Design a binder for this molecule. Sequence first.
Ligand code: HEM
Length: 295
Amino acid sequence: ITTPLVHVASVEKGRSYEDFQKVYNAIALKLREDDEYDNYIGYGPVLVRLAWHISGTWDKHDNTGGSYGGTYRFKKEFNDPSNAGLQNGFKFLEPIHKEFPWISSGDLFSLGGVTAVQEMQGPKIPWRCGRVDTPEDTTPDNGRLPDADKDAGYVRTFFQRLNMNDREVVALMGAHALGKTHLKNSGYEGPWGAANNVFTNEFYLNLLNEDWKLEKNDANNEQWDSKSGYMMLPTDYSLIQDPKYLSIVKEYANDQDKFFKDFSKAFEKLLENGITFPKDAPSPFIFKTLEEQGL
Ligand code: HEM
């Protein structure tokens, strides 16, 4: 009994690449519009974290969770303490979903992250459509998303459930160059770097160049802080405590074009975990940025 479920992607009725490019633009044009958010950081980082959390619930052993069903719209997943603060990213996409009611929740949640990465001068991320909304009883329970106070052994074993290897783990972790930690959300405070809304390899550079000291924040949690004002979660710092993670961290710090390649592969794999694309399914889309369109 209990065999892994199969989630077959179904492209929305009469929708092609041009339809989803208009959803990309509406997201991208609203990114440069609502620039005041979070001390002028912008909704860029919160949309990338939203796409990762709606996908990070996947369990490869029974094919439960994932980005397919768009179950973040339900109260159980919406009120997950691990998702504290993501409601800002949800509210950003609400007027966009009203303009495009044909697109599914799972497609819009994942496309929001893909748009935010590219519009913040990141790598191109191929994106496939076809996610189908599933009922509220398919919502995964709380507690599938990772804790921040753990070590590299936990990081490696957690991502094994998402079918990620060491190279994919370190690459996905480079997204922490975006945004900051908020004490009201996670019990951690501070940004990882200086360019909080530009997708670069600054995460790995600061991990190797700053003098990190383990300190205690106002929430009684311990986080690594440097004299420049940056911070690293214990799971961030485990990437240089582990010798196999460290070699990859030093690699991305010395080559951003390489980090862009491995992030684009791992981030798309994360957003597509648990989805079965049939033989007649369309090819992954590479959306043009607003700059490339003159818009
Ligand atoms: C072991 C893995 C990870 C842990 C423990 C972790 C933990 C955290 C925590 C605690 C925050 C603080 C959020 C807040 O206080 O508002 C955060 C923020 C963030 N995370 Fe992660 N994360 C992990 C992996 C990832 C991945 C895989 C991605 C993207 C692919 C990602 C993207 C982000 C972004 C962009 C933010 C900034 C949010 C904002 O500024 O609003 N993280 N992370």
